[PDB]
Design a binder for these strands. Structure first.
Ligand code: CL
Ligand code: CL
Ligand code: CL
Ligand code: CL
Ligand code: CL
Ligand code: CL
Ligand code: CL
Ligand code: CL
Ligand code: K
Ligand code: K
Ligand code: MG
Ligand code: MG
Ligand code: MG
Ligand code: MG
Ligand code: MG
Ligand code: MG
Ligand code: MG
Ligand code: MG
Ligand code: MG
Ligand code: MG
Ligand code: MG
Ligand code: MG
Ligand code: MG
Ligand code: MG
Ligand code: MG
Ligand code: MG
Ligand code: MG
Ligand code: MG
Ligand code: MG
Ligand code: MG
Ligand code: MG
Ligand code: MG
Ligand code: MG
Ligand code: MG
Ligand code: MG
Ligand code: MG
Ligand code: NA
Ligand code: NA
Ligand code: NA
Ligand code: NA
Ligand code: NA
Ligand code: NA
Ligand code: NA
Ligand code: NA
Ligand code: NA
Ligand code: NA
Ligand code: NA
Ligand code: NA
Ligand code: NA
Ligand code: NA
Ligand code: NA
Ligand code: NA
Ligand code: NA
Ligand code: NA
Ligand code: NA
Ligand code: NA
Ligand code: NA
Ligand code: NA
Ligand code: NA
Ligand code: NA
Ligand code: NA
Lengths: 149, 147, 115
RNA sequence: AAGAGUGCAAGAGCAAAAGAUGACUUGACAGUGUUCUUCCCAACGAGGAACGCUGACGCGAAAGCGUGGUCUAGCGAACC
RNA sequence: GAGGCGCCCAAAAUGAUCGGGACUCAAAUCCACCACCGAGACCUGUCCGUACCACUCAUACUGGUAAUCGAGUAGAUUGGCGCUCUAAUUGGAUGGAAGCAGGGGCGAGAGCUCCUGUGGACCGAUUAGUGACGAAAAUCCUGGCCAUAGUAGCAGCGAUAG
RNA sequence: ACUAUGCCAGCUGGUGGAUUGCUCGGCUCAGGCGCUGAUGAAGGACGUGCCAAGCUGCGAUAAGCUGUGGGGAGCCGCACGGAGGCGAAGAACCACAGAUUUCCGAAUGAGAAUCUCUCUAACAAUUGCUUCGCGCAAUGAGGAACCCCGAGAACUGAAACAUCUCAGUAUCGGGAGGAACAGAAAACGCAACGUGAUGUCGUUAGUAACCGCGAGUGAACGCGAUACAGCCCAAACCGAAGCCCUCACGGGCAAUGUGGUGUCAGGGCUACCUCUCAUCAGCCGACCGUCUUCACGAAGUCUCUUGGAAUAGAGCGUGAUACAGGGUGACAACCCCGUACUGAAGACCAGUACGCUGUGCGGUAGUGCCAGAGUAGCGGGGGUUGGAUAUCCCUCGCGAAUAACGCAGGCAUCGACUGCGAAGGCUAAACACAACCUGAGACCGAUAGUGAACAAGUAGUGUGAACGAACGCUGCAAAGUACCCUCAGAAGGGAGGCGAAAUAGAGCAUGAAAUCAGUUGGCGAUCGAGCGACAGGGCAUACAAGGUCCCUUGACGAAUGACCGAGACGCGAGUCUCCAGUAAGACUCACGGGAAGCCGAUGUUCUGUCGUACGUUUUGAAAAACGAGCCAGGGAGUGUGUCUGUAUGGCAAGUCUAACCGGAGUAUCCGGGGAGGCACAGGGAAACCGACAUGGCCGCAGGGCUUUGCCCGAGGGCCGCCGUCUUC
């Protein structure tokens, strides 16, 4: 039995005095009315903040952390380039929605437990260090090298 | 009402499995005498034409008593009759074929006909009650395997 | 409350085992399963890898999922496993149903609860 | 021993001083916090205060004092 | 000098009061005392609900605990009754369905059910659904109906008319 | 034993029309289809029948005339009467085509509330062609909404209000079609080595943008789909090679340019190379599919019982590519219509696709020959938009270039780069609506559902604009009550007849309550008012559906708990001790006896206790606060979108598909579809940068151990560390 199903006989359906449940006065005015006066609590404060750049000059990076690559090397071995006790993977082939992005960037969250040779457009400093410290290497794509200028 | 494909597909498989359990099938109310269910049959069943032929076959398979169960109609209580809903009858035997549904079996009391590729949960479990007494054609039985 | 007849059966069997063979884990798992689905365990492999030891059966009052890597050779008992989880676990170890766990070990000895 | 004085209400504080005189000096400094108040309990902004730190300074032999005026009034959102 | 009880001080409007009758070694007052009456409180038998405990899949049973559980407007929470039509499963009806009137039984209750009469063709139960789903009230809406009442009017006017 | 006027409850009969059952009507969804009119529509008026008031039909040829096809032995509309007629000379009825088709009406010779007038004469008015003559033509008005072009509020929201919002909504003016509008880039601008007419659907996204930067408002490109289709002028260069009317003669148009060429794949010209393909103008002209209509169409009308009637029960049979639905004297696959299968026709698709005839595509070099002006653009003032310095439009003023040029790419100018060619024009298909045809339904079921199941936009109200009801049911068959008596009587009554039933007798199925007549039980003319609850008496009661109940005795017996008697105490009322936790003690049970209006229960009344309705307003209600005469029926948390929780379920580092596509049992359902959304990493206004798959401690549950203490301890808790912003 629902709450609603139990209202018949109650007369006020949980509304308290029958003088409640009238128009918008019972809610302090329609929609966000009062957000600066009687109802100000827990509204964001009024005002204007910052600026936006045009949607068409914004670049979108496709990102992946080394952890995701590394946790998956064996399954990607069934697909991408095992060589050298080592693995070579072109990151553009791994990342979902790569083509829909301006560039592919490898980030540094988690561990690298294998020797990896990584090809991407960009690398965090931490992703470079982890992949090297694991005895691997980082290969900047041509587009990646263009980004240097 | 929306339903996830996976969840719906699971229920199809689950209803299929309920047809293989003779206790479930008898629980549902179907009348028949045999240990083994579902009834599987030669693909030549699909070449049958006359309804009476199907009768004889079903009688030979000890399964015809369900048709007897479904041969009676209830004239329903209430105003549905004013809308064309006067009658109803028990569900009896689902016939699952491969090429096309069986015109020979279709007019049997309470019978439904279906095909392995598109057979659905309602077919297998009318009113959501699992364990419908079913006959599969050999090819149907195999085709249903990947559903 | 619960609509899945198999979940209910599982829960009923977990209680019967706890009340007889004295396994308190099974009672503990029964009570968690009786709690709302929202609170049920969902555990990835990285978590099992971290806290499990061999010849101690991992018990998940919930479902095991497939993120992460499991090297350790362990028996994992759960209400359910994702397809991937069960595959990764069966390589290095064994994935098992709670119904089997109760059969092999009704006293619930040498188990570690993981969520 | 405090009735004087300490800018201004009232109440409070102060004597080798928090008062007076003389000299020097600009801490009435920039940055950023902790905490209390505002709003006892008990959520709520501006404002206020207490107490720190970082940096730079003043004075002092030095410890130290200086986060304006001994303390509680002297205050103002968004948009522009 | 002090104390107790009373007296004067003391006048209001329809009929005077201590609730009334009425009471004077009281049926008044003060000091004590004796026996009684008198709640749903308190004690006590049985039952019910709720919470908890043991056993259990489940108070579904069974057993146990509550001196330390049992009032409640607004409101929060949760089990259940009834109505329509759909579906599955399954029943009733011309050897008399539904409805209606009167009556018998069950349930704390929402309500369930039977008998008799009337009626003369449809009606349920369980499960899962569905929703134009439950009225004592809103100067609520529409229709019908009682009192009012055999009552007012059928006189009044410069045209009193037979 | 009496008692009237009355009170309460039943009974019989009314009144009333609820209830149940029934559905010739609604409501809603879906598929198909879709224009009419000066050749006078739509609408209206008035006619039209043997008798004809309403509705329908029709139009002085008037519920109809003719032809062809179908159909068939009956028929003369709804409409069951009296008379009479029609039909085998094939009627009725249905389809298609034709004939007739009064008056008013755009209403058109002129006038006029449907009539009239005259020169038997009129396309009135506006307009094109024009033999300049109304000679040939056009427009007008209607239509359920849909569509396009103009004019354009306010209540309201912002808790006031002015910009904003309601909203370019309501409403008004103009107009098209079966659809409309749009449409082959002076586009886009995931900036590209990219896309490639338009509309629509899904998404992009409540994103960008607007806004007392308040409340609110709110796209696009792209993507996935649906459907796909691309072309013609102006000019250059030609220059009468042309077009319209007419059978023809002949007339008219046209140098102010008809016609050829040509149209960013730039074209023309000149010189070449090459082709018959593109395009355009024509001719033919469908399949399938879909919608609707139609033909044919299997098998019991056997036995017994009940019944007025079998379509019921029991028994014995049958068909099924047909067990949808309906009818028939009650539950019908087999009695009748139909239904499955197969077949035929019409309509739409469509003058489309395919096919064909004619035409001829295209390439190179040269050539500043051509290429749409109050335009592009700028300024003043407004409106509109998300359009922000960057929407679209109006108005006043100003105002280019000429392809060697010009416009765009969301501020302006200059250069570069990329895209594109305005100021001329056409264009199928995919999409909107629902008049019309058909189908469908967890919709309503006669106070509902349309206002309308009925005479329904009827009756009726208003000067008018406009407003606007209620009314469904005899019976299987009318067998719809003959005859007789009564009566002023074609009334009504009595008697009688029919039928299973007349308490089915005409607004006639059922037939509630309020309530009325008569009557039964209880009370009753000396007595007091929330009308009752609970307990107990009296009187009343056919059966059924309830069977208990009384008395004596005895057993058990919780709390509680004595008399008398004896002893002692107190001025006294009285108390203490013992008899004694005894006798007694509610319920329950057993033996014996008894009750059948007896016990329960029901009606009424009496006695005791308690008690000034209900709901609402209120600190406080019996209130001299508000509401209702009574009864029945009706009468109030609903939908979409978005957001945030919760319970259950699937799948899980993922998850879900949307539009739409295919299949099919054709709205269900099966298979595709991941466009896109959320989640997977955050921080920062931005530029830009970019994180613990575990280092330490405590410790619940659980586990372990040699156990009352040690150990491991997910989750949890406290730290540490890491990413980013600000930061000497
Ligand atoms: Cl930005
Ligand atoms: Cl995890
Ligand atoms: Cl280990
Ligand atoms: Cl209950
Ligand atoms: Cl593009
Ligand atoms: Cl008892
Ligand atoms: Cl006894
Ligand atoms: Cl509600
Ligand atoms: K699984
Ligand atoms: K057009
Ligand atoms: Mg509010
Ligand atoms: Mg994508
Ligand atoms: Mg009913
Ligand atoms: Mg200060
Ligand atoms: Mg100070
Ligand atoms: Mg301001
Ligand atoms: Mg209570
Ligand atoms: Mg059932
Ligand atoms: Mg009420
Ligand atoms: Mg009334
Ligand atoms: Mg009177
Ligand atoms: Mg006179
Ligand atoms: Mg005229
Ligand atoms: Mg306002
Ligand atoms: Mg306003
Ligand atoms: Mg405001
Ligand atoms: Mg707007
Ligand atoms: Mg765009
Ligand atoms: Mg031409
Ligand atoms: Mg505007
Ligand atoms: Mg009506
Ligand atoms: Mg008027
Ligand atoms: Mg009647
Ligand atoms: Mg008397
Ligand atoms: Mg008051
Ligand atoms: Mg009602
Ligand atoms: Na509430
Ligand atoms: Na209210
Ligand atoms: Na508000
Ligand atoms: Na404010
Ligand atoms: Na793309
Ligand atoms: Na502050
Ligand atoms: Na309450
Ligand atoms: Na049409
Ligand atoms: Na007539
Ligand atoms: Na006509
Ligand atoms: Na004309
Ligand atoms: Na003329
Ligand atoms: Na307001
Ligand atoms: Na106002
Ligand atoms: Na504004
Ligand atoms: Na302008
Ligand atoms: Na552009
Ligand atoms: Na009616
Ligand atoms: Na009595
Ligand atoms: Na009130
Ligand atoms: Na009251
Ligand atoms: Na009062
Ligand atoms: Na009245
Ligand atoms: Na309602
Ligand atoms: Na996707």
């Amino acid at each position: 039995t629902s709450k609603k199903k139990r209202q018949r006989g109650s007369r006020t359906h949980g509304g308290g005095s029958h003088k409640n449940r009238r128009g918008a006065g019972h809610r302090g005015g329609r929609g966000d009315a009062g957000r600066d006066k009687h109802e100000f609590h827990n509204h964001e404060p009024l005002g204007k903040s910052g600026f936006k750049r045009p949607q068409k000059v914004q670049e979108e990076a496709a990102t992946i952390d080394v952890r995701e690559i590394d946790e998956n090397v064996t399954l990607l071995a069934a697909d991408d380039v095992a060589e050298v006790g080592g693995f070579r993977v072109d990151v553009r082939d791994v990342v979902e929605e790569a083509d829909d992005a301006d560039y592919v960037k490898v980030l540094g969250a988690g561990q690298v437990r294998h020797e990896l040779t990584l090809i991407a457009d960009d690398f965090s400093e931490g992703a470079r260090e982890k992949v090297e410290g694991a005895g691997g290497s980082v290969e900047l794509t041509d587009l990646g090298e263009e980004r240097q200028a | 009402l929306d339903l996830n494909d996976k969840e719906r597909q699971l229920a199809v498989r689950s209803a299929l499995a309920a047809t293989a359990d003779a206790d479930l099938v008898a629980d549902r109310g179907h009348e028949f005498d045999r240990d083994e269910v579902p009834v599987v049959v030669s693909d030549d069943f699909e070449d049958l034409v006359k309804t009476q032929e199907v009768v004889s076959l079903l009688e030979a398979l000890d399964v015809h008593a369900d048709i007897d169960r479904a041969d009676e109609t209830k004239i329903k209580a209430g105003q549905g009759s004013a809308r064309g809903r006067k009658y109803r009858r028990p569900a009896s035997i689902l016939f699952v074929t491969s090429d096309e549904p069986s015109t020979a079996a279709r007019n049997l009391a309470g019978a439904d006909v279906a095909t392995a590729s598109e057979v659905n949960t309602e077919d297998l479990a009318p009113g959501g009650a699992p364990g419908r007494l079913t006959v599969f054609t050999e090819s149907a039985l195999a085709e249903v395997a990947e559903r | 409350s619960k609509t899945n007849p198999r979940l209910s059966s599982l829960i009923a069997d977990l209680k019967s085992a706890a009340r007889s063979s004295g396994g308190a884990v099974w009672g503990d798992v029964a009570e968690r399963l009786e709690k709302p689905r929202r609170t049920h365990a969902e555990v990835n492999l990285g978590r099992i890898e971290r806290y499990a030891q061999e010849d101690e059966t991992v018990v998940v009052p919930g479902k095991v999922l497939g993120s992460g890597v499991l090297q350790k050779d362990v028996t994992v008992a759960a209400v359910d496993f994702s397809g991937t989880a069960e595959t990764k676990i069966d390589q290095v170890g064994e994935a098992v149903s709670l119904e089997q766990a109760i059969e092999n070990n009704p006293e619930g000895s040498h188990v570690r609860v993981i969520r």
